[PDB]
C-alpha cells in the first residue's frame, strides 16, 4: 500500500482516539484496531482500522515493543504526523 503522512490535531487533555495492537514482541506491526468516535483520529479523517503505524512525528515504530510504542504515542502533543500504510 502507499505510505500516507496524516496530520492529527488534538488538545493535551485528549488521547489520540485510537486503540492499537501489535509490536515487536508480537512479530507484527503496530496496527490501529479501533477509531473512537469524536476523538482526534476520527476527526482528522485519515486514519483507519487496519492501518499500520510506521512512525509518529518521525519516531520509527516499525521495530518497537508494544508498550514503548504506547509511551511514544502518548507523549505527542498538538499537531501530530502519522506515517501509515493500510496493510
Amino acid at each position: 500500500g502507499p505510505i500516507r503522512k496524516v496530520l492529527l490535531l488534538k488538545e493535551d487533555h485528549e488521547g489520540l482516539g485510537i486503540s492499537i495492537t501489535g509490536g515487536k514482541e508480537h512479530g507484527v506491526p503496530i496496527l490501529i484496531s479501533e477509531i473512537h468516535p469524536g476523538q482526534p483520529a476520527d476527526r482528522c479523517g485519515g486514519l483507519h482500522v487496519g492501518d499500520a503505524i510506521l512512525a509518529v512525528n518521525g519516531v520509527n515504530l516499525r521495530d518497537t515493543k508494544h508498550k514503548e510504542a504506547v509511551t511514544i504515542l502518548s507523549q505527542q502533543r498538538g499537531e501530530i504526523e502519522f506515517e501509515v500504510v493500510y496493510v
Partner: peptide, 10 residues
C-alpha cells in the same frame, strides 16, 4: 494460554 489480546487505547 491466557485469552487476551494485546490492545491499548491511546
Amino acid at each position: 494460554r491466557l485469552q487476551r489480546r494485546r490492545e491499548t487505547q491511546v
